[PDB]
Amino acid sequence: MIIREATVQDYYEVARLHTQVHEAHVKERGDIFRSNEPTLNPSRFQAAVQGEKSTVLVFVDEREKIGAYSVIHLVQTPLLPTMQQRKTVYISDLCVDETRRGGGIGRLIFEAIISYGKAHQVDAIELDVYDFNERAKRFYHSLGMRCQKQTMELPL
Amino acid sequence: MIIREATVQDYYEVARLHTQVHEAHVKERGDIFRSNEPTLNPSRFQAAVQGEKSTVLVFVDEREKIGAYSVIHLVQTPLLPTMQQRKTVYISDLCVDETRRGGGIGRLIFEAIISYGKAHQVDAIELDVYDFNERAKRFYHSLGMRCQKQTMELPL
């Protein structure tokens, strides 16, 4: 129905969506991620909502239920001797309810992030995604995103 | 041929190697990287050499030139509600002289990094590499490294 900015009163619905994605990461990379109740710290959520450079978006359906959310950050680095000045929207979180994928919700949310980025005349949108996460990768790829760089690892 | 810790007196030889890698990145991703003379800040080099958690290694051979260097960091994150405790060696820089490729130098340097990681009983060695850099990616893969996660981008 609509995409709006979240408020602090959206914590419980957002936190539930956060747990779906977090537990999937715990399952695949338990060497890095740990289970907890809650998985979303409400103080961290409050800071994201009220932060100067961060924005929390939610997709709300016709029944006033939150179906997806995203957290984004306006990032600016100045001109340096060896690095260009750069302005980006960084997506730290984007979760679509597990039972509501394939309904176009994720694309709608991403289009809102694009609109925001253009309004702020940013150079690019960026995010980070784990290699095991084929669902996320195919999603971002289908929307035109491409790999900039990667973290490589060798367990000892 | 030896691998030893660098000192501040190794600045110029190391800076030259840093420049080779940096200008390759300027050429391929000039949207992010910028040319400068020098590309390696000597105050930053000194801090890396003398840093509590950083180590700079150099490969010296043939009498008596530096053919490669690397900068590594001991990284420790504590147990958190949603993240496991983790200890790693992060490689922030690794440059083998362009003119000295195909001589087993990169592997020798990496083996010394592995030894360090083992002495410090770390969980993994990690690094970041740009997607355009097929040579570095293939080389790191040939050492057994694998993609953990990636940064994706969409220019606007």
Task: Give domain limits for chain B.
Answer: 2-156
Task: Return the CATH class of domain A2-156.
Answer: alpha beta
Tell me which residue in A126, A131, A149 faces B131 most closely, judged by beta carbons. Answer: A149
Tokens found for residue A81: 């001797």
Contact B146 A131 (CB under 8 A): yes
Residues of B with Cβ-Cβ distance to A128 under 8 angstroms: 149-152
Report yes or no: B125 and B114 within 8 Å, Cβ to Cβ: yes
CA A69/CA A60 separation, integer angstroms: 9
Contact B128 A151 (CB under 8 A): yes
Looking only at the bridges linking them, the beta strands covering B124-130 and A2-5 are: unpaired
Residue A71: closest CA among A100, A99, A51, A101? A51
Resolution (A): 2.0
Distance of CA A102 to the CA centre of its chain: 18
CA B83/CA A94 separation, integer angstroms: 19
Sequence-distant (6+) residues with CB within 8 A of B54 are B47, B48, B71, B72, B73, B74
Please tell me the experimental approach by which this structure was elucidated: X-ray
Cα-flanking dihedrals φ and ψ of residue A24, to 5°? Answer: -70, -35
Looking only at the bridges linking them, the beta strands covering A124-130 and B86-96 are: unpaired
3-state secondary structure at position B103: coil
Question: Within an 8 Å CB–CB cutoff, is residue A114 touching chain B?
Answer: yes
Read off the DSSP letter of residue A49: H
Beta bridge partners of B96: B68
Q: Rounding to the nearest 10 degrees, give the CA dihedral for residues B43, B45, B47, B51.
A: 180
Burial A107-139 (b: 16+ CB within 10 A, else e): eebbebbbebbeeeebbbbbbebbbbbeebbeb
Report yes or no: A68 and A106 within 8 Å, Cβ to Cβ: yes
Question: Within an 8 Å CB–CB cutoff, is residue A119 touching chain B?
Answer: no
Tell me which residue in A39, A41, A146 faces B153 most closely, judged by beta carbons. Answer: A146
Beta bridge partners of A86: A77
Sequence-distant (6+) residues with CB within 8 A of A112 are A3, A57, A70
Instruction: Calculate the alpha carbon distances from A3 to A69, A106, A123 in Å.
Output: 9, 11, 23
Tokens found for residue B74: 């001991």
Cα-flanking dihedrals φ and ψ of residue B149, to 5°? Answer: -160, 165
Beta bridge partners of A130: B149
CA A39/CA A21 separation, integer angstroms: 10
Listed in sequence order, the DSSP H helices in chain B are 11-28, 42-50, 105-119, 134-142
Read off the DSSP letter of residue A122: -
Q: Could you write out the DSSP letters of every residue in A4-18?
A: EE--GGGHHHHHHHH
CA B16/CA B38 separation, integer angstroms: 9
Contact A146 B156 (CB under 8 A): no
CA B103/CA A28 separation, integer angstroms: 38
Residue A72: closest CA among A13, A100, A113, A34? A113
Read off the DSSP letter of residue A80: -
